[PDB]
Amino acid sequence: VAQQSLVLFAAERGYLADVELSKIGSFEAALLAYVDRDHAPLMQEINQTGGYNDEIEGKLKGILDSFKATQ
Amino acid sequence: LDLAKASATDQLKKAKAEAQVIIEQANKRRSQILDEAKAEAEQERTKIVAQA
Amino acid sequence: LDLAKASATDQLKKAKAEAQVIIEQANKRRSQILDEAKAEAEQERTKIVAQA
């Protein structure tokens, strides 16, 4: 159920525009996914229901900006 | 000019050193987590192989 | 002052690029070591499954 959180953040805000190369997908996806998913376990709770509110914009913007900028 | 150049060089050196230390700590933590996940995956694969 | 500021900016940019390249090389080496350890653990688990 992590397709909505990872697909509704990089393909909506602007996190996937900085890493459009094919070689950066493994390091950016593994580092951002493992660092963002391991540093915050509450974000998975957003996949337990609907979303599209303050938790989706705050968790997606902070997790996408911190995970995409700290990789 | 000397104060701004020394402050910019010291801030750039401190930021590059802190970013390198944070990247080394993140790489070491990622390597240790990958080793623990590989050991847990090997133990789970051995237990599943024994049960199978 | 102009040569010191330009040399300090070029040295800071070169130090940041070298530190980022060294961090990327260290992360790639750690990922390769983790992949080799995971492959060795998978081979040991397969050999233990065949022996079992």
Q: Is C10 on the interface with B (CB under 8 A)?
A: no
Question: What distance in Å separates residue C51's CA from the closest CA in chain A?
Answer: 34
What SS3 class is residue C48? helix
Question: What distance in Å separates residue A49's CA from the closest CA in chain C?
Answer: 34
| Cβ within 8 Å, pair C30-B35 | no
Angle, alpha carbons C34-C38-B45 (nearest 5°):
150
Taking each helix axis from N to C end, the angle separating A54-69 and A3-10, rounded to the nearest 10 degrees, works out to 70
Which residue, chain included where needed, has tokens 């995956």? B41
| Cβ within 8 Å, pair B45-C44 | no
Which residue, chain included where needed, has tokens 């397969």? C46
- For chain B, give the residues followed by a break (C–N over 2.5 Å): none
Q: What tokens were used for B23? A: 């990247």
Category of A49 on φ-ψ map: left (φ > 0), alpha (ψ -120 to 50) or beta: beta
Q: What tokens were used for B16? A: 């590059």
Q: Is B26 on the interface with A (CB under 8 A)?
A: yes
Q: Nearest-CA neighbor of B15 among A53, C16, A15? A: C16
Say if residues C34 and B38 touch (Cβ distance below 8 Å). yes
- For chain C, give the residues followed by a break (C–N over 2.5 Å): none
Experimental method: cryo-EM
